[PDB]
Amino acid sequence: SGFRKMAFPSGKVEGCMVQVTCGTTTLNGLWLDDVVYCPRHVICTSEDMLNPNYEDLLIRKSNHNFLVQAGNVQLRVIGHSMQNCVLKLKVDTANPKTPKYKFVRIQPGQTFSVLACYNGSPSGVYQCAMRPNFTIKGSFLNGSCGSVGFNIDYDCVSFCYMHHMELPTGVHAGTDLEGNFYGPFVDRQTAQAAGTDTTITVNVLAWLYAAVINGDRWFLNRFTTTLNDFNLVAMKYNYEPLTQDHVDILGPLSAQTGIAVLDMCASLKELLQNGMNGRTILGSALLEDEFTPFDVVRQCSGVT
Amino acid sequence: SGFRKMAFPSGKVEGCMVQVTCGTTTLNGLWLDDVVYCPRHVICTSEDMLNPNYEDLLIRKSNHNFLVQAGNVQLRVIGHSMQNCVLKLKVDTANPKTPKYKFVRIQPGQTFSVLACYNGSPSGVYQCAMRPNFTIKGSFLNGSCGSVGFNIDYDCVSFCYMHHMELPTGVHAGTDLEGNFYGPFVDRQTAQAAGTDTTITVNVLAWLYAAVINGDRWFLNRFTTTLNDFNLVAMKYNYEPLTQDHVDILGPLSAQTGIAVLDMCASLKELLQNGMNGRTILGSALLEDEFTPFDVVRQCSGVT
Numbered sequence A, B: 001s002g003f004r005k006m007a008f009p010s011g012k013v014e015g016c017m018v019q020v021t022c023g024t025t026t027l028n029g030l031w032l033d034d035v036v037y038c039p040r041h042v043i044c045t046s047e048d049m050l051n052p053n054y055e056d057l058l059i060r061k062s063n064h065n066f067l068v069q070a071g072n073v074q075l076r077v078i079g080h081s082m083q084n085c086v087l088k089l090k091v092d093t094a095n096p097k098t099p100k101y102k103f104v105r106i107q108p109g110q111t112f113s114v115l116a117c118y119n120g121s122p123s124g125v126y127q128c129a130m131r132p133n134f135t136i137k138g139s140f141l142n143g144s145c146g147s148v149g150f151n152i153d154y155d156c157v158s159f160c161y162m163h164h165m166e167l168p169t170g171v172h173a174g175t176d177l178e179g180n181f182y183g184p185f186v187d188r189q190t191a192q193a194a195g196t197d198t199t200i201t202v203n204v205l206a207w208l209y210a211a212v213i214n215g216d217r218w219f220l221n222r223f224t225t226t227l228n229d230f231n232l233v234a235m236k237y238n239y240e241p242l243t244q245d246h247v248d249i250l251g252p253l254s255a256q257t258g259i260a261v262l263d264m265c266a267s268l269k270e271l272l273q274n275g276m277n278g279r280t281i282l283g284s285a286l287l288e289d290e291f292t293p294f295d296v297v298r299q300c301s302g303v304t
């Protein structure tokens, strides 16, 4: 019992972190096999940041300008190439600590762990969600670029995020491991609109099921609703519209608790319309949306 | 910018996790140098749990009854001994992945990371506080016993907690790495009173400083207070009385923000007396007490 915002164990990813320096800029890189991946803005200087011409900036760089260090180990760079917003630095040595891995592009509303790093050294690990507007609300300071987000399925690390930028609003933006930004963002020091965000409804429902499994049940009521009725409330409260695909992924939790998904929707409807009345659910005084239905099942069953 | 409930990177601790089986029971052990540490209740069976005579139960066990496996590796047990509520199994091989480490007994109100494990395999990592009543509000299921809590200072892992028990209330109890329980708890399946808990005042103040550093400032007011006045409010709201030692540890945050500790106390006083009025601070709708002043400084400066 108990329910926590749990991150994946970070060891497999710690073994992949390196420091990359190009000129005056230092950030983090991810060393997998014989390639080091890092944000392409490592090649920028102060006057470059407003609208860098990355192709021209990279043309002035040679393999020997990319200093890659894995703590004590200096890596020899034998090739470089830019793919979207990432640089791929080919090195002459495969990382002996490369775990089984995949590169995946996650969907908005999915969760992942971030290993925050500075100068190639891990600082901490936390779990977060990719917002519906493709931003993440992380904890990143200058030097954290190149830190990655990931999920682990038994022995395989699926890398889904590389950190690139902090928007003027204090929220974070980055790319998949092929260097494609999540959302409309570009790697320029320019104010950039993040879309209207919404609350991840299916995750709030999954977390209400986690709450019932762990004994917090005060919010359960005598009511039910329909997808149509619930979605009128979701509209009012800026929640994602619930679909049958969301109801289907909540199937295991509904089966375990015996609480029909639409009955849980009626509890969520009452909580949206009335608030928590000074009470808490799993130690939170707000409706939590950073646990997916898979996260709830994994945590509630003890998956390793 | 951004502020998250961040755990330490767990890699150094993942390398120490092993599975220990004695008879029918399997739990986790911590392999450091040539010793494996685990909860002594691994030697219990179902009818033993209400009041086990650990000395007698252990006398029926030999080195070869303790099956220790580090995934693929089977460890050869060459000695066993009980120290308080832990067993120390001497093995013939020093763990090649033993990090620099210390065993420390943490104080109530301090924080640490937990690497939840099942069958010697890491499942996830989360940050939590040792409550003032010596319980922890973790996320542990059957099989998680032997999972450890720790902090890391550069390359040194200070182990402070080993998980032993879930109280009937769903809160958790365990020991330091010498097997001494935190709090009044005993390793028996008996209902056991956990003391009256309180909110960790110095941590709430540290988190309000983290909030100001990250832009959440709506709670700052035109008021000040005294330690005496504040402690009357702390008494009413079940918060730990604030002392000059707490004010002193908040010195760096007060210096960084320019907000005198007693002025922050006046903001905390107003929040206790009036609530949050439907607003949030660092994404929380309640007053958070699981970040120490050191945690805030580390997160806000990018320590690795």
Ligand SMILES: Cc1ccncc1NC(=O)CCc1cccc(F)c1
Pocket: A041, A042, A044, A045, A048, A049, A052, A140, A141, A142, A143, A144, A145, A164, A165, A166, A167, A187, A188, A189, B001
């Ligand atoms: C300061 C900080 C804090 C947290 N996360 C990230 C950051 N850093 C940034 O946003 C870097 C922005 C950037 C864009 C384009 C070119 C360039 F050289 C740099």
Ligand SMILES: Cc1ccncc1NC(=O)CCc1cccc(F)c1
Pocket: A001, B041, B042, B044, B045, B048, B049, B052, B140, B141, B142, B143, B144, B145, B164, B165, B166, B167, B187, B188, B189
């Ligand atoms: C079931 C569970 C869930 C979470 N954390 C921990 C647990 N397990 C326990 O409390 C074990 C209690 C115990 C005490 C004394 C002897 C004995 F054989 C076992």
